């Protein structure tokens, strides 16, 4: 039952002041500063969390590999696979429907 | 005597509007050529809850007709609108629910809301939840139309005043009886600091004109003139009638 | 360990000690005392012996 103390000068249990107590040599328990939980990317159309992109802080994506922050697809990384399939059908079917309605139908 | 609580309200120190989480200003987009001689199409992206008001607000996203990019407005939801809907605004718009047309194009008996009291001011009349205004008649001689205000009064407006077809959502809001003082406390979470109202007769003569003596009463008529100075104007002002109605 | 003017930074102290005594400095830590004097902890390169500089200056 080793009781610990805050290492930094913050004395209040705010969200940015998260701590985890880990063990060390001789039964010593120290204080670790744990990070905050961050949300992931969402499809711009349906607002669903995309798959294949991690949930980390915005600056941490700079440290990520260039291929580990986006999905190799048209509108990948900003739209779900369903968000894009409807886009293709909308872009194609509407173009075909008016190709026979006007201009000397 | 002191200054009555009504006088202290015009100062605006603790009686300011608690508008921090409010979404913005709900009004029509600025009138231009495309809203005067053509139609623009808007896409209802989402419907949200604006604190301090009983009606939902819709985030409509019009494309910019003159430049490249979007143009995001904040309309008031007519009852029936849904996400992903297309709404058309202009002098040639279809007469569907949610479309915005000049008040001079709607036929007689059409129900509209968010009416402009002057062309280009983007919404004055019929804005509360469940409210609407009806079109009474047209006068093509001076291009003016008559509409019936939700209070029952009749008004004359120019035919160029835009309006949104339908009724405002969130109807029947006030039909639910508040049960607890806590529920009334939470009603003004995004409103002024006016809820717990102390009766004037319960105060002292310094604070209020009704501050009574050994028996809680008024002692003088509570129907006053409109010309009464601030501080003594309390109760009923320019009242033509009183009592209960049979 | 030195006492320097407060209006000098770690960069100017590092050059000043290098020029004044002809030594190599790899680390400087400074604290400003309550009276107003800035105390500088100057660490020399491992090749240069600090004990000989102290005797040369006059500390020994």
């Amino acid at each position: 039952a080793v009781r610990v103390t805050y290492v930094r000068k913050h004395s209040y249990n705010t969200k940015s002041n998260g701590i985890r107590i880990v063990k060390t040599a001789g039964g010593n328990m120290t204080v670790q500063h744990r990070q905050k939980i961050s949300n992931g990317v969402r499809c711009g159309d349906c607002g669903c969390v995309l798959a294949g992109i991690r949930h980390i802080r915005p600056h941490q994506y700079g440290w990520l590999g260039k291929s580990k922050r986006t999905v190799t697809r048209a509108y990948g990384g900003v739209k779900c696979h369903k968000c894009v399939q409807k886009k293709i059908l909308r872009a194609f079917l509407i173009n075909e429907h008016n190709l026979i309605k006007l201009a000397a139908a | 005597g002191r200054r009555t609580l009504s006088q202290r309200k015009g100062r605006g120190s603790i009686f300011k509007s608690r508008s921090h989480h409010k979404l913005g200003v709900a009004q029509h987009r600025a009138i231009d050529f495309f809203e005067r001689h053509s139609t623009v199409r808007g896409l209802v992206k989402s419907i949200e809850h604006d604190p301090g008001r009983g009606a939902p607000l819709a985030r409509v996203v019009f494309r910019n007709p003159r430049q490249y990019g979007l143009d995001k407005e904040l309309f008031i939801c007519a009852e029936g609108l849904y996400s992903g809907q297309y709404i058309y605004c202009g002098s040639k718009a279809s007469l569907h629910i949610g479309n915005v047309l000049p008040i001079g194009q709607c036929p007689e008996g059409t129900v509209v809301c968010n009416v402009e009291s002057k062309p280009g001011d983007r919404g004055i009349i019929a804005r509360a939840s469940g409210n609407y205004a009806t079109v009474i008649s047209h006068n093509a001689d001076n291009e003016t139309t008559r509409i019936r205000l939700p209070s029952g009064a009749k008004k004359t407006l120019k035919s160029n005043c835009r309006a949104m077809v339908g009724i405002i959502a969130g109807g029947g809001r006030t039909e639910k009886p508040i049960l607890k003082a806590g529920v009334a406390y939470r009603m003004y979470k995004a409103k002024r600091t006016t809820w717990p109202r102390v009766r004037g007769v319960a105060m002292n003569p310094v604070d209020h004109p009704h501050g009574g003596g050994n028996h809680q009463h008024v002692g003088h008529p509570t129907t006053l003139k409109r010309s009464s100075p601030p501080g003594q104007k309390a109760g009923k002002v320019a009242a033509r009638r009183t009592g209960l109605i049979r | 360990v030195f006492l320097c003017e407060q209006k000098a930074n770690k960069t100017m102290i590092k050059k000043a000690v290098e020029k004044r005594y002809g030594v190599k400095v790899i680390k400087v830590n400074t604290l400003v005392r309550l009276d107003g004097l800035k105390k500088a902890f100057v660490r020399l390169a491992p090749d240069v012996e600090a004990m000989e500089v102290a005797t040369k200056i006059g500390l020994f």
């Binding site: 000068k9 | - | 400003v32 005392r33 309550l34 009276d35 107003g36």
Partner: protein, 50 residues
């Protein structure tokens, strides 16, 4: 406090400097009436209002 501005600490340090007494050699000057420093204070006796 543990945290203080740079100017505030220097004015704190001067208050430490001025909390001293007359040196012995000064008291031995001819025609000397200065034996004590009447501008003296102690942390538990008087707060310096700063």
């Amino acid at each position: 406090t543990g945290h203080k501005g740079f100017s505030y600490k220097l004015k704190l340090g001067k208050k430490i400097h001025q909390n001293r007494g007359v040196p012995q050699w000064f008291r031995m000057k001819t025609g000397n009436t200065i034996n004590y420093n009447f501008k003296r204070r102690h942390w538990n006796r008087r707060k310096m209002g700063m």
